[PDB]
Design a binder for this molecule. Sequence first.
Ligand code: HEM
Ligand code: HEM
Ligand code: DP9
Ligand code: DP9
Ligand code: H4B
Ligand code: H4B
Ligand code: ZN
Lengths: 405, 405
Amino acid sequence: GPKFPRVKNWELGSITYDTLCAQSQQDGPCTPRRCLGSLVLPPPAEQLLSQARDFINQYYSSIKRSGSQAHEERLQEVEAEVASTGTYHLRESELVFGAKQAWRNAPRCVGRIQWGKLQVFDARDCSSAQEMFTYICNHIKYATNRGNLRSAITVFPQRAPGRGDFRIWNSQLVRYAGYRQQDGSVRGDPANVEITELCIQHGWTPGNGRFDVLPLLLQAPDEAPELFVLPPELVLEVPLEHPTLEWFAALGLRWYALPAVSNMLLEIGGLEFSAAPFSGWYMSTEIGTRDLCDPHRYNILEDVAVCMDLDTRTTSSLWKDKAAVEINLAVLHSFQLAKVTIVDHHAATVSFMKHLDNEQKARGGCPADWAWIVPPISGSLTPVFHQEMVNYILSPAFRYQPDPW
Amino acid sequence: KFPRVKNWELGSITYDTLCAQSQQDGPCTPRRCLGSLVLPRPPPAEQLLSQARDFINQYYSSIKRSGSQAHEERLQEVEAEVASTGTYHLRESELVFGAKQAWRNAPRCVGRIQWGKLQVFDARDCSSAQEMFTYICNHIKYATNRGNLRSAITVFPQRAPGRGDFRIWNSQLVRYAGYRQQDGSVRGDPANVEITELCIQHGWTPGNGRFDVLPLLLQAPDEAPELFVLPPELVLEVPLEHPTLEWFAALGLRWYALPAVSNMLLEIGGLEFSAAPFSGWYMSTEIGTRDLCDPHRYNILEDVAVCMDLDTRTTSSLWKDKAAVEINLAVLHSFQLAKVTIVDHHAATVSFMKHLDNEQKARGGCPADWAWIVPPISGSLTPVFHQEMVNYILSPAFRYQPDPW
Ligand code: HEM
Ligand code: HEM
Ligand SMILES: N=C(NCCC[C@H](N)C(=O)N[C@H]1CN[C@H](C(N)=O)C1)N[N+](=O)[O-]
Ligand SMILES: N=C(NCCC[C@H](N)C(=O)N[C@H]1CN[C@H](C(N)=O)C1)N[N+](=O)[O-]
Ligand SMILES: C[C@H](O)[C@H](O)[C@H]1CNc2nc(N)[nH]c(=O)c2N1
Ligand SMILES: C[C@H](O)[C@H](O)[C@H]1CNc2nc(N)[nH]c(=O)c2N1
Ligand SMILES: [Zn+2]
């Protein structure tokens, strides 16, 4: 049949072929000898120019003016800018197109049905840590919108030759502190012990709770990072309660409303935006299963199982499974009660299947990372578990980058 | 070169050096990962001879007599047979070592900690479908052992040039019939409609129940398959009930005790055994989650949810998750009550992590398919979810093969 990967849905028996992978210009980690699909982690005017031309071609194709006079003029304008300056700059409309395409192209994101609705904030005129903080606060206010969350990304100046990078040191705009204890344990979020100590080293006076919002460490080019505390009024949080287990509220658990990844690099046409925080809204399992139940995170499974009086002495009682379902239900219930946007894993995966169908028609495929798209609880109860997926790298893209310290 | 493998829950790292022994290519390439696909899209004497030498070498190393006199002689015998006849035959001890190694090498099996304990039945002297049936009956009795299941494999004659294969048409030795009804609905197991129809077409008088055990369609070389009904007393079944929901037993559900894949090909030293049924014992999620809850299988989720009087109006009530957990609990409870061997997914995954460590020390790694090792429910609540894995093909191996019709 067709000389492209054949992809099957085992629940429905349907088949599609992915032709979009032909547009990939970057290799992944796999080879015919071994699959590394489950691993978490993966300028010369010569390569920059090829990447820029490819992106300009993508942009002109998107506005249906491929091969037009304007297309050819833009291409020559980029070559001349690179020729004399070693780099180039994107037009406003090109940046918007690029950021939306990077989201659309993200294999690990199950929320891509929303890709065309992204609000892109242009902050390429930023020149200091203080101004970065103002842009970030504005992003947070706009995105949170008192609970009716709106997808958004704020783009700071791109990396420049011979000049330091703009960087947000925090992994997310909102994260809880993790305090290493005398006995070696951690009060708060164990995932954030390093960033927490860095904040302390930079003058932050730490709290002592389990849910203390961390300050931001913002770095303008060639300067030590500066510390900024987020005004509490801007950080929306949701106290957690359960619809039928009245004692759940007594555990004093809570989570923040805005998921805002802030340490990824946005690559568009060879240009690199080292600081471009983006945010959408939470899928409930992110909080209920991973943040609260991972053994290396808050690890609350046993505490909740004990309150439910389950037999935590043996695996066959499925106490972990029962407690996790209740915790996830509490997260959903609590956000709904607080009128804060959130999506359950069944609804998110159903919407992602719709996205796959949309993209099959629009582009001939959709890069997706099965291990990340299938939720952490109830995997086979969702439609995505039964859908084969092809994973490849397309640009524009969001990519991991080394920590700045 | 060697892939770095990390466990994100513990922070530990290992390097897989075993993948270097892989001689057969998988589906991925640097351009795209197809790790989530279920199925892949006389032989030259020289190739066969190299596969045979490698295998004989593996065997003599296993009994610590590498380079010995017996080793050299055996190598000479295989060479002589292939040179004169184009093929060769394994000695029984080699067949036993080879079957255990194929299990040990199976990337999709989470039960490999048991690999060294396997009863191997040599059925290579079988010359008719009737004889196949006797060996299959003895396999089932031995493996079932009145509920104290014992791992076993029965090996029928290898494939030979220009001659039809010995084949078992059924996908497993014990499976429930699936009957197409007028309205296109199915009574029984939808996954088995095709084989059920073949059995009828070959003279089976069908039942009309939801749990009717299918007869076996056995095929000797170049002859039509013959039908054999399994003596009811040999097929141990477990009636499903719930420890606290009295009405569950009323659903009239049941499952068989013995999982016994019968359509895979066993490859050892270049030789291929097209009929080599194997069996261990079930991991509870196979029955509770996939067989009973898959939408395209018995699909009982909604019925159970309604019996539990859950709110099936919206996905946000997590009714699917709550029902799934209770069904899995019923399976565990029922098998333990019937005194039939079964392992829950927590215990199985914990044992698989021990197996990974044992193999890292023994061979420098372990091929594993992450999407298949992580259980269909409660994925992140198990240790394997947080463990990076490397997938590759080692030989001896179990492989898929085309359906015989
Ligand atoms: C609108 C709602 C959205 C939802 C529900 C959603 C949901 C998700 C989920 C569940 C993941 C996996 C996160 C994890 O397990 O760590 C993910 C990853 C990701 N999302 Fe989305 N997403 C949304 C919006 C966005 C937006 C606005 C962007 C970018 C403009 C985006 C870009 C990404 C990227 C790049 C990743 C991978 C991050 C990583 O590798 O850690 N998502 N998303
Ligand atoms: C001792 C009990 C064992 C347990 C608990 C166990 C468990 C499993 C599970 C849960 C799977 C995935 C099945 C699926 O989702 O379809 C599997 C696959 C597999 N197991 Fe094991 N297994 C056991 C014994 C065996 C034995 C004795 C052999 C062979 C000698 C074996 C060979 C395989 C192979 C080749 C696969 C992949 C089958 C496929 O691709 O459909 N297993 N096993
Ligand atoms: N819904 C999300 N999710 C992504 C951010 C939240 C996610 N649950 C998280 O905490 N991400 C961290 C932990 N794991 C990622 C990694 N690669 O290590 C980063 N984003 N969005 O824009 O709407
Ligand atoms: N526990 C197992 N499990 C494997 C066989 C049972 C499994 N639940 C099953 O029904 N397998 C079918 C459906 N999926 C596989 C495939 N590749 O299509 C075959 N094996 N064993 O020997 O102990
Ligand atoms: C080792 C394994 O790749 C790792 O635990 C992955 C699996 N799937 C995931 N899926 C999502 N969405 N998020 C994660 O952090 C992970 N972690
Ligand atoms: C499409 C996807 O590969 C498919 O549904 C896989 C996922 N993981 C699985 N894992 C196991 N153990 N068994 C299966 O049948 C599957 N099916
Ligand atoms: Zn791969």
